[PDB]
A paper describes a structure:
RGS proteins act as GTPase-activating proteins (GAPs) by interacting directly with activated Gα and accelerating GTP hydrolysis thereby promoting G-protein inactivation upon reassembly of the inactive Gαβγ heterotrimer. A unique hallmark of R7 RGS proteins is their modular architecture encompassing several domains and subunits. The central GGL domain forms an obligatory heterodimer with type 5 G-protein β-subunit (Gβ5) which stabilizes the complex and docks it onto effectors. RGS7 is a prototypic member of the family, broadly expressed in the nervous system and periphery and involved in regulation of multiple GPCR systems with key roles in physiology.
To gain structural insights into the specificity of the RGS7-Gβ5 interaction, we solved the 2.13 Å crystal structure of the RGS7-Gβ5 dimer complex which required buffer optimization using thermofluor. The structure contains all domains common to the R7 RGS family members: DEP-DHEX, GGL and RGS. The core of the molecule is formed by the Gβ5 subunit, which has a typical β-propeller fold commonly found in domains with WD40 repeats. Notably, Gβ5 is engulfed by all RGS7 domains, making extensive contacts at four main interfaces: the DEP domain, the DHEX-GGL linker, the Gγ-like (GGL) domain, and the RGS domain. Electron density is visible for residues 19–218 and 252–450 of chain A as well as 19–218 and 252–450 of chain B of RGS7 and for residues 2–353 of chain C and 4–353 of chain D of Gβ5. Interestingly, in RGS7, the Dα1Dα2 and Eα1Eα2 loops adopt a unique conformation in both molecules within asymmetric unit documenting yet another alternative organization and intrinsic flexibility of this region. In RGS7, the DHEX domain is lifted upward and away from Gβ5 thereby creating a wider groove between DHEX and Gβ5 when compared to RGS9. Most prominently, this includes much longer Eα1Eα2 and DEP-DHEX loops that adopt different conformations. Together, this distinct organization of the Eα1Eα2 and Dα1Dα2 loops positions them close to the invariant Eα3Eα4 loop to assemble a strong cluster of basic residues on the surface of the DEP-DHEX interface. In RGS7, the DHEX-GGL linker forms a 310-helix embedded into the β-propeller ring at the hotspot region of Gβ5. The present structure shows a unique mode of Gβ5 integration into the complex providing the first example of Gβγ like complexes in which N-terminal α-helices of both Gβ subunit and GGL are protruding away from β-propeller fold of Gβ subunit.
Numbering used by the authors:
A (entry chain A): 18 to 218, 252 to 450
B (entry chain D): 2 to 353
């Protein structure tokens, strides 16, 4: 389970923190009132993570340690709220029996026994926290019929704790408290046990024939050298670094930093900037993405009497934008205008794409012209698009 | 001898033919693996210091925020939560403009229509529904609800295509599906994932009829929306694939997983080309998205933090604190000026 994977990683860290030679020093300090066994400070945890996990930012190491505490691997001995502080606050490791990876979804009947046992401690003078006392009142109302047996169960546990080693009893009482600090947290604290609803859930002759066709299909795939692939990724990204607002400050300013929306109005203007026109030259996809670039591209081709390829491509792209109710009649209109013999805007396909399209029109669909659009797209990419970028119209836009 | 059918004499001929094709592919894959991306990226200069901060805090949802999507106008945002409410914000001013309550809890998916006049959403209702957006006074969004998609398990992700007329859906029943919004008709079903499908992302090339998806089977799959077949699959994560996103050129895509790693796959190289991880990052990555140039990969993790990655060099350039619970969704602004994170702490934050 995915929730178990982060527990094992946290438990690996706890295993390294408990090493003899290079672990967290566990001390028995004394205060003005009492002696406190087997404790260590929060700054000890933060400095251990910085060194042994190589975390430069102390905020990141403190944040990682605060999630281990919240999940219940170490806990503050003086607070029901499980968090980590980068100071002298004293902490204590959780015993592996109370670990969240140990199949723990405790019931309210177990919490009622615990809360009932707590009110018996200290000669029945222990006072629960306000949220604990309010939890006990709800549990007493819920288990009102069987409360005599919850009391007997807690009274039986208290007799074991009474005849128990004083130092082990002190440590285990806080560890049992830290267990319930995870599964019944303080109101306002994140319940680390809440989980995502998605995650809360023949002969050996045909076998070889199934293999051979499988591997042959894999060999038919066209792959590239990592050098060529890395070169194209490096050059494509470097091309747009000047356009990336996270990397280069926008002109005039980033609206989220300056509260000035003039950058958005310039991006939406019908008069394009020089960087916007320069971007059209990166490739035909950039010219077609930009609505102004699409208008100027089409405006140029119509001025050279060669727009039939682009207007067909634009017609097919609109076809795939129509509801399926409209596509059968629209397929016939595209066929009559661009492909049928004697068409007003006749385009020239290869015989393979024209034959396939003629049969696809017999049964219209959203992908009737895909084989043809694919051909026309590559044709413009090598003919109509270089004509637009090299036109005086584009050059006069590129030079302002 | 003089008898014996000798079936194994021909089975060994087929075994020696299947072994050779497999070794043929292994040797070809090794031959193409001449360098590593981060080794070539040593030619690139390292990035400067980043000072990204929270610029807006969207407070209003009553429970865990589970998804969000930017509007094409670069400022409006749709967001959904566990309590069933979907909210449309003007994030630049943080004003709530629209809101609809759904008949289910855990509305795990929401999307913004390309026109900006509709939204789609769904979750434990095992459906995906389209709601219109209007400037109507006392607008009743629920009365215009258009039920489009329909699965046998929960809806995990959804997305309009290049128009308001079709939506992609990913479901916990192991299928992705393309739908006609106006009629509710199933245009294509995508079977292949061995477990729940958790995410999907449409190909950046509006010329491309492909999309990628990730699931609990640790796989990411590229689909052909015309045939319905999976044309390419990747399995290198050690746990669930929670989010997928295409690199801006469309020749690559990234993924975030519960194994606390983010990985970059290149479709031309047909292999994983980068792994984004660190010893101190042990919680799963729930969402990933690229900056405009693809140099930066933003990722939201269950450790409540956001880690920004240099896509080319692999090093982590920033870690961002602020959310007080898991980061469930993260998307970069349509113009790349900001990115928005949604969290289980009931809030969304816009960073820049």
């Amino acid at each position: 389970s995915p929730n178990m994977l982060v527990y094992r990683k946290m438990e690996d860290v706890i295993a390294r923190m408990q090493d003899e030679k290079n672990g967290i020093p566990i001390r028995t300090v004394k205060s003005f009132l009492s002696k406190i066994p087997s404790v260590f400070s929060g700054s000890d945890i933060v400095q251990w993570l910085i060194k042994n996990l190589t975390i430069e930012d102390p905020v990141e190491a403190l944040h990682l340690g605060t999630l281990m505490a919240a999940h219940g691997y170490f806990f503050p001995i003086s607070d029901h709220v499980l968090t980590l502080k980068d100071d002298g606050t004293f902490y204590r490791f959780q015993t592996p029996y109370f670990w969240p990876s140990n199949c723990w979804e405790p019931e309210n009947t177990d919490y009622a026994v615990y809360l009932c046992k707590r009110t018996m401690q200290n000669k029945a003078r222990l006072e629960l926290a306000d949220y604990e006392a309010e939890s006990l009142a709800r549990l007493q109302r819920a288990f009102a019929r069987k409360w005599e047996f919850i009391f007997m169960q807690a009274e039986a546990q208290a007799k074991v704790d009474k005849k128990r080693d004083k130092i082990e009893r002190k440590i285990l009482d806080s560890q049992e408290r830290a267990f319930w600090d995870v599964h019944r947290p303080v109101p306002g604290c994140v319940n680390t046990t809440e989980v995502d609803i998605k995650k809360s859930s023949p002969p050996t002759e045909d076998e070889l024939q199934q293999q051979i066709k499988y591997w042959q299909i894999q060999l038919d795939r066209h792959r590239l050298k990592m050098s060529k692939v890395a070169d194209s990724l490096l050059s494509y990204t470097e091309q747009y670094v000047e356009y990336d607002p996270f990397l280069a400050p926008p002109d005039p300013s980033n609206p989220w930093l300056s509260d000035d929306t003039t950058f958005w109005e310039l991006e939406a203007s019908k008069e394009p900037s020089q960087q916007r026109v320069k971007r059209w030259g990166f490739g035909m996809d950039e010219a077609l993405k930009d609505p102004v670039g699409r208008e100027q591209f089409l405006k140029f081709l119509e001025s050279e009497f060669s727009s039939e390829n682009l207007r067909f491509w634009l017609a097919v792209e609109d076809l795939k934008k129509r509801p399926i109710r409209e596509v059968p009649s629209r397929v016939q209109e595209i066929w009559q205008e661009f492909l049928a013999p004697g068409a007003p805007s006749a385009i020239n396909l290869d015989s393979k794409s024209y034959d396939k399209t003629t049969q696809n029109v017999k049964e219209p669909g959203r992908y009737t012209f895909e084989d043809a659009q694919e051909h026309i797209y590559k044709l413009m990419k090598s003919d109509s698009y270089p004509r637009f970028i090299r036109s005086s119209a584009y050059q006069e836009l590129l030079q302002a | 001898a003089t008898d014996g059918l000798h079936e194994n004499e021909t089975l060994a001929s087929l075994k020696s033919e299947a072994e050779s094709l497999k070794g043929k592919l292994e040797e070809e894959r090794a031959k193409l693996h001449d360098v590593e991306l981060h080794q070539v990226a040593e030619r690139v200069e390292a990035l400067g210091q980043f000072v990204m901060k929270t610029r807006r805090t969207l407070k209003g949802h009553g429970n865990k925020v589970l998804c969000m999507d930017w509007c094409k106008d670069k400022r409006r945002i749709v967001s959904s939560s566990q309590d069933g409410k979907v909210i449309v914000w003007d994030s630049f001013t943080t004003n709530k403009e629209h809101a609809v309550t759904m008949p289910c809890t855990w509305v795990m998916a929401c999307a913004y229509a390309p026109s900006g006049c509709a939204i789609a959403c769904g979750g434990l209702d095992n459906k995906c529904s389209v709601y219109p957006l209007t400037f109507d006074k006392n607008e009743n969004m629920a009365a215009k609800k258009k039920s489009v998609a329909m699965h046998t398990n929960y809806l995990s992700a959804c997305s309009f295509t290049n128009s308001d007329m079709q939506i992609l859906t990913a479901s916990g029943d192991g299928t992705c599906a393309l739908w006609d919004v106006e009629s509710g008709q199933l245009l294509q079903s995508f079977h292949g994932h061995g477990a729940d499908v958790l995410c999907l992302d449409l190909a950046p090339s509006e010329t491309g009829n492909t999309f990628v998806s990730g699931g609990c089977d640790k796989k990411a799959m590229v689909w052909d929306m015309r045939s319905g077949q999976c044309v390419q699959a990747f399995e290198t994560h050690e746990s669930d694939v929670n989010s997928v996103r295409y690199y801006p050129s469309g020749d690559a895509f990234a993924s975030g997983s519960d194994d606390a790693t983010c990985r970059l796959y290149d479709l031309r190289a047909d292999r994983e080309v980068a792994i984004y991880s660190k010893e101190s990052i042990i919680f799963g990555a729930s969402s990933v998205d690229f900056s405009l140039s693809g140099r930066l990969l933003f990722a939201g993790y269950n450790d409540y933090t956001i880690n920004v990655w240099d896509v080319l060099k692999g090093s982590r350039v920033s870690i961002l604190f602020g959310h007080e619970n898991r980061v469930s969704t993260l998307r970069v602004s349509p113009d790349g000026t900001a990115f928005c994170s949604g969290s289980w702490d009931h809030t969304l934050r816009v960073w820049a």
